[PDB]
Amino acid sequence: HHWGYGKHNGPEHWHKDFPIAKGERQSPVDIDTHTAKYDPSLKPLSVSYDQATSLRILNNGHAFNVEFDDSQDKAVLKGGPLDGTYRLIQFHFHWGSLDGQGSEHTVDKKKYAAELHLVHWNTKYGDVGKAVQQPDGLAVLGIFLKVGSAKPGLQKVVDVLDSIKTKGKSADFTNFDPRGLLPESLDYWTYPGSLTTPPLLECVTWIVLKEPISVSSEQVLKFRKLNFNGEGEPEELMVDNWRPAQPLKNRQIKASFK
Ligand SMILES: NS(=O)(=O)c1ccc(C(=O)NCc2c(F)cccc2F)cc1
Ligand SMILES: [Hg+2]
Numbered sequence: 001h002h003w004g005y006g007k008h009n010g011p012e013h014w015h016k017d018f019p020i021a022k023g024e025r026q027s028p029v030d031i032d033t034h035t036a037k038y039d040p041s042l043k044p045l046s047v048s049y050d051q052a053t054s055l056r057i058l059n060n061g062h063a064f065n066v067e068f069d070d071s072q073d074k075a076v077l078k079g080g081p082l083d084g085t086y087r088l089i090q091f092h093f094h095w096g097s098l099d100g101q102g103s104e105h106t107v108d109k110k111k112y113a114a115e116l117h118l119v120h121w122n123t124k125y126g127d128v129g130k131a132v133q134q135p136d137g138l139a140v141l142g143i144f145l146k147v148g149s150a151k152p153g154l155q156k157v158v159d160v161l162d163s164i165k166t167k168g169k170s171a172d173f174t175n176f177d178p179r180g181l182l183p184e185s186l187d188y189w190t191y192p193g194s195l196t197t198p199p200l201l202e203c204v205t206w207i208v209l210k211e212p213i214s215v216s217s218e219q220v221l222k223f224r225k226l227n228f229n230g231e232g233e234p235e236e237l238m239v240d241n242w243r244p245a246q247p248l249k250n251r252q253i254k255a256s257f258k
């Protein structure tokens with residue numbers, strides 16, 4: 001039926017409706033640190049989120065997205081392996097039912113508690129719909145979350161989750177500063193990939209940060225209390241909404257650090 005992360009509609013079944021699942025540049029992938037090539041020609045990332053305008057947070061089944069006003073170059077990502085300017089459109093997480101799993105990308109086979117994806121689209125394409133039909137249409141900034149000390153900048157997100165417990169629910173979410181979610185170092189790995197959820201389009205330049213941010217057990221606990229189901233339907237906890245690592249194939253992971 002409609003795709004999900006359960007036994008009968010999970011990742012292993014997506015190929016039946018989305019053939020691209022067995023494609024050449026699928027994500028996520030495992031990052032083998034000893035095989036990633038240090039590329040000194042990579043520029044530093046330029047994250048300009050000072051004028052970010054968040055608007056809403058919503059539970060779309062699958063996960064919760066915090067949306068931003070992308071009608072103007074307010075919050076952008078440039079530099080790194082990117083050519084052109086990419087506007088932030090939304091951010092979401094993938095997490096697990098236990099602290100030992102949750103991330104989509106893995107580092108030397110190590111899974112983290114969750115992973116944050118900051119989605120940006122290439123402005124040269126006019127709108128996100130066009131951008132998804134291009135090889136360099138999207139840039140997703142991936143940040144790993146480890147369980148440890150609480151992340152202050154994440155608390156506003158955590159407190160509003162009760163308002164969007166079920167699928168289809170949304171809440172006004174203005175004045176949120178995404179800069180509060182970045183680690184201190186911007187060192188990263190990069191490779192050409194795809195969306196990790198259907199349509200699974202291969203239009204993404206992945207930029208995965210080396211340094212994870214730490215969040216408290218209590219903070220991660222609250223993510224786990226969300227529901228995949230809509231109001232009135234039988235409760236299905238939103239946990240393990242992650243796709244397992246895909247084969248790297250003919251791709252090379254570059255690193256911006258030595
Ligand atoms: N986890 S991840 O790889 O960062 C990621 C990021 C964005 C999207 C998305 O915007 N879906 C929109 C969308 C549709 F729902 C249908 C067709 C095209 C789309 F762009 C999906 C997965
Ligand atoms: Hg594409």
Ligand SMILES: [Zn+2]
Binds near residue numbers: 093094
């Ligand atoms: Zn994601």
